[PDB]
Amino acid sequence: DAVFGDRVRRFQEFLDTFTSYRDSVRSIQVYNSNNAANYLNILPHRIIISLDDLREFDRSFWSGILVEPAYFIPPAEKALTDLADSMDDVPHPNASAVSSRHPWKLSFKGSFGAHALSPRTLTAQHLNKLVSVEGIVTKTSLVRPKLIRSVHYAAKTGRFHYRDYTDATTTLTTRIPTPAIYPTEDTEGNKLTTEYGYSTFIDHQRITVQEMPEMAPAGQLPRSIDVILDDDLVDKTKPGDRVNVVGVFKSLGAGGMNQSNSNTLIGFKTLILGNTVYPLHARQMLTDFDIRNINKLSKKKDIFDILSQSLAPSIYGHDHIKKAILLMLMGGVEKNLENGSHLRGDINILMVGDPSTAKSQLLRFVLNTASLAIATTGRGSSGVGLTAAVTTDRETGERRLEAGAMVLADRGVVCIDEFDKMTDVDRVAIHEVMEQQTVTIAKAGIHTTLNARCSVIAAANPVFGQYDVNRDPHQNIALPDSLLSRFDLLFVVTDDINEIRDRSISEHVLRTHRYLPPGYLEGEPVRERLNLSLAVGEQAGAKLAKNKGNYNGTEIPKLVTIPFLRKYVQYAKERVIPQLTQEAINVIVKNYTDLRNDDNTKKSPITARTLETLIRLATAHAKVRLSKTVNKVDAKVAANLLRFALLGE
Amino acid sequence: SLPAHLQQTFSPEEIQFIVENEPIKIFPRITTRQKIHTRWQLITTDDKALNNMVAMRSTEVVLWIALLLKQQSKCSIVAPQWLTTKELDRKIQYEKTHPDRFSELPWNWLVLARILFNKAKDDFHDPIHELRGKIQDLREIRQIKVLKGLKYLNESHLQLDNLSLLEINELRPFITEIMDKLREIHTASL
Amino acid sequence: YGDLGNKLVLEAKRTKQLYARSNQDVNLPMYHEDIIRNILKEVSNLRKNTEYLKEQQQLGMLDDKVAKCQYFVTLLCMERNKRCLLAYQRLRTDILDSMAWNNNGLDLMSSSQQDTNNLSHQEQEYLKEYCDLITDLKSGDLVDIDLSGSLVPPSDVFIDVRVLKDAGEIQTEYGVFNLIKDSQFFVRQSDVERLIQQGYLQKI
Amino acid sequence: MGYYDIDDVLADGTEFPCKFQYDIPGLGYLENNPGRPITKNTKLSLPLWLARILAIVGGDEPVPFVELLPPDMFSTKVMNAIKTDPVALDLHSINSHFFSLAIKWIMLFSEKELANVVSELLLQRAQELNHHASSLSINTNIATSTFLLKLEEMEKEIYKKSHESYKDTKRWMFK
Amino acid sequence: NDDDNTEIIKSFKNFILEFRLDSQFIYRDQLRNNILVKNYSLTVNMEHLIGYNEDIYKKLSDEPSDIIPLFETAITQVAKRISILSRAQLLNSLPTFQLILNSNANQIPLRDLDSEHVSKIVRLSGIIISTSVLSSRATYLSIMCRNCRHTTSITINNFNVSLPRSCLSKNCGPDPYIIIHESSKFIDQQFLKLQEIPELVPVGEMPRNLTMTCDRYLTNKVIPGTRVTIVGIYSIYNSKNGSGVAIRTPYIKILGIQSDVETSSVTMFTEEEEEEFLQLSRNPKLYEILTNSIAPSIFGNEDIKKAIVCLLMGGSKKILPDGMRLRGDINVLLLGDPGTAKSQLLKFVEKVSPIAVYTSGKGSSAAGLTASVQRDPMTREFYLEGGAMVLADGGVVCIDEFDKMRDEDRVAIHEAMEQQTISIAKAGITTVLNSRT
DNA sequence: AAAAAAAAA
């Protein structure tokens, strides 16, 4: 009754106290007005409030929101709509666009405390309470419009009628259900024609999110919960993306309480109405002093060695492997031509060696440090389901494609273990994809070409238990020559027995295992922790706190921390697109001719593809030093790396 | 007495001793009137009561002497007034009707009860189980009231009007330490 | 630098827990004077370094600010090392005295660790002198009271006690107690406390 | 403040961010090459036992040789989290000497906004400490142990003393 | 009718408030300690109930599903009596208390259950094979009318109600009611599957499965593959959706669960067993007293037993700030002549370990070990089902006849044992799954 | 529509 008015005026006072949201509303209004009629982006009517300030202002209203949002959110959005209706000034409005009546629905950020849960932790006593759930997106539905309010007109009356429809999932508060029957007759019998272009329709999508497999109980499978979100943010993220969804967790449906039940063992239905979504990514922006640090470090003469040594400090040796990984993570630019079709842009690396030589560990490091990557094993995958799958939707009842392993990894990197142990048949999928970076599916009446420009790194062991140096390279590798010719670089690793290197690697590994997590004693095992204190998160240049990166002193040369390297590669992959010159061309052609006509034994045959690989590596090295042109030193270093990878020092 | 941290509070045995060092009434079964025979001539209690004692009459002795005579057939302890159903009923009514004040009870509360129930079993005029249950109910409600009142922990002082010895003893190490920490925080902040 | 010293202090805390969980003086651990003498030799190196630094400072070649800051840093190092060592030693002496006072000042070599060789020799002579002090203390004006007796208040006069070890017959006041193995006595409480503390009796 | 107190000497060893507000040639010999002097405005993680005094001596413009930065432990994020819900927050992850360190910090810097929030913190947690201490078995679910593993190092002695007191009372009562 | 219910409630309340042994009222103190820790439940032992008075136990054993709710509401009445003050006249967030029972009656095998056990209290033992996801149930429903539009409340018990006919007193419909989901109370329910123990299966038969339902605190207590002892009610529920005439599928309502592991694997141990373990650890020859204890029926082998002990203890898991993982287990392979007692050690190692599975390398497959991609026939959706190397996560897996295993099957275990994680990509499912064993 | 087990070539 009057409690609605009291809550509305309390929220109005709160909005009057804090002047940031009014400035945001004025800015969004003026930006929309400017976009209207000046020679495509439109800002949606949504604003985010930090409930920490609300707690600092009124504890009762804060607790009312966090405990029973149903009786508190609608008054807040009504007050926001009234404030917007008072602030705005449009003396000359339109006709169809003025009837939107968007309530300016809200978003939240700040500390939640005991309401920041996990999909497994959700239980009965957390119902009807605003919560934030963390997880990974597993599948999504289709964006289908739904009706809200229909506009009707009759020729005789000249009065436009309107009828409003609300469903269980449309509003927080349960109201009397309304069927979708179109009113076609007036009270006096006048014929009513439905008026499209004046009615209200909003998008609808359903997504499902599951708990992360890493934080799961022993011997238990991950569990999932489903999320409904509409209007704005309707097509954000995708399957295979870490998300934090803030919304209201409520039950819906009779759940067999009526006569429709067949057994007494019936459970209700639970579902969360999402209010906002945030990307976790375990942040992705760069500051001004970050740019200063990047530039001043790139002006150094030895950036490439520092960055190569900065990858996986606990892996002894494999220097050129680290250099190749660095060049691969930020490979060359893609070239397209109106007549030359497509030219491949990235680099692929394949490794083969005897057991226990740190290939899987380096691959896991690449997976951890990459911006986007997917983990895959040869034996536990099937090529048909690795690219696209056909499944039926439960809601619509139709069948739609599901993205495969590497389609999710578009513009990323795919890492495969036990490559040689994979079934031969599935290999054709790779033969399809690595050829033209496009997978075509044609099955059950679906005809579509899916783009997949990912780079693939693989590690396989030779046919014998250990590599035979005295044998032909072809007979040591089980894979056929057709796919081996595509991979740019072939690396062979062996653990030659040598007492000096054995002692060095032994003391290094023993150094690694004597490590203690900071602030934790050695007498007890590693214990799990909770999430961050904030459900949603967010002097210059004089600190160099995490810039230099030399966290501990053990060698004269420098070392940089991983997050700054990720920032560097993010900056480089976007801000720089270099071009090549004739000076590097001379070196490239000269070294190609010298390598091709040396006429000595070599691990792998060469062809015109190797020169294209040299060009791509030269472009990648022109990117690594943040220059817009290719220097001949890049050609020299690429030639040296290729000669090592094909001959050996 | 050091024994680690046993130098700061009283152990329950010390509480039992300090309670049993109190007067009590007794009905002797024998006579020791002097011939008008060994003198008691004790140092920490009046002898004139013990020496000038005649059977089947009221006299006051310390509790431990009463228990020692009760071990033999030389004693008959008289139960106090507050150990009966008609008194505990009005007491529990008083606690129920007054939700903020602790009822008035002797500071030997629950302790004389334990001793009398353990030793003096056959001299009560009321069933033992009923009295034990009513005492348990009293303890229950007083515990509820103490737990409710504990929420206010000022850094200045506090008032607890009618708490017995055991209730104070079992709560001292927590309340004292918390208030001391609060005082330290406030003093370091000024 | 004083981080080595931390390894001592943390270890001492574990010892305190051994004192806390057991609530009984038993199996005191074996000393860690090796790390202590390592700290002593490194702090001797620090002290000689300070003396040489003062030498160049008095020479006039050294800068005053460098000399003063190094002096403060070294003084802090010595202060922290001394603090850690005394924190160790005070707890050691406290537990030593606590176990020494309660066994009538005899140290009970007939039965607690057997050879008490886990203590340093200085700690052993400290224990002997403390036993001497405890024996001396009750020889003054408190000769009629046994200070090292029990501290549980006397609650009953006649108790049942059960023998634990075999012996001969022991003289008492106006009587004799023959400690036949595995027998039960119904005797005075104020006559068998010494035997119970010695461990020859059971089931108070 | 006890010299022979073990908890205090343990807590004095925590590391705080600092800044060399004043340049000193020849320093850093215990951290990097001794012959390389440490330049101005260079940040390290110095322990408290030298940061307290080295930032107050001055030495000589009697500016201190070092300047102490606001540590990340006392940050707006932690204050917001502790004000929102203190009962379910685990301070053991932030630190094991949180309360003694906070007392030292508030003694060094007078800040009338930390004393009341910290006071309400331990006042609110004391009630659940008493609730768990009063619950004696006659073995238990996950909630009590989950709370007990969230406790601060300085709260363990209060919990243990309360538990022993209640256990002794029950042992004497029921014989 | 109401008089008998009041008499039964009074009897149970008198039992709770009057039962004492020596000088302790055990149940009142139990209620206190439960309320202090927010565990609104109470445990009743059969022997105490029988010793107090036999009529109450007779009535409980006669018609359990009708009598138990009276006891479970008497419990909450007593809790409100002895936990809050009248104050001469609030939150009152105390739901109906859960009742848990324990007993020592003769066990009944699963195959022995028949028509005479309907609506009776039975005790039985089995092995858990699958646990369903928890679902919600309504207890306090706020119901709104549409035409007259008044408010009403419905209280629902879980033992053994539909929309009321007509309105409450104009001319409404048959059932003009809707459910107000807000201001409603909900609880949790879970389904479990039980299988007969291998040693009690009759001659030439196969194991039989049974369905159990638990609710509230009893949920999320067991994991698949653990021997358990269950006490509950054997009742029957009809299947309208689902042969024969007047058929009724039976099931079990769980009242009490006992497990050997006691859900120990943070520390749930009390002080007595803790100090016992510490004293055992102070034994200066514990290595030999453990080596002698590994299969005392096998003679001669000593290094094998030492290796088995070392494997059982396990290594120390390590992690690094760089993100790489280090394995924390050791793998022992027995490769020798026949007759040297290799499998008899495998079955004993399976028995000793808290979590273990025993399987043959001959009757096994790559898809039957790591993860099998099943497909629900009803909703027609894909989902992962655990195999045998995921059930043994955090324990030891017993494999014999390792050489008889197929070459194509033997390669899937490489990554699963060198990195302790398995990655699968089938039908669009891209999930990395952890398996440490 | 897609995964997994079995007998015969």
Ligand SMILES: Nc1ncnc2c1ncn2[C@@H]1O[C@H](COP(=O)(O)OP(=O)(O)OP(=O)(O)O)[C@@H](O)[C@H]1O
């Ligand atoms: N240079 C190295 N530095 C540190 N550790 C190393 C090195 N070489 C090998 N190792 C160790 O070898 C072990 C074997 O790991 P892993 O199985 O991932 O290696 P791999 O060579 O990829 O083996 P496989 O071919 O069997 O998959 C790891 O624990 C790793 O730490």
Ligand SMILES: Nc1ncnc2c1ncn2[C@@H]1O[C@H](COP(=O)(O)OP(=O)(O)OP(=O)(O)O)[C@@H](O)[C@H]1O
């Ligand atoms: N050392 C031993 N002490 C006692 N019994 C033994 C010993 N070695 C073998 N046996 C006996 O051998 C019998 C058969 O043993 P079992 O079948 O387990 O042998 P195995 O070596 O595992 O065989 P296989 O290699 O064929 O699988 C058992 O009944 C067992 O009692």
Ligand SMILES: [Mg+2]
């Ligand atoms: Mg490997």
Ligand SMILES: [Mg+2]
């Ligand atoms: Mg065998």
Ligand SMILES: [Zn+2]
């Ligand atoms: Zn009506």
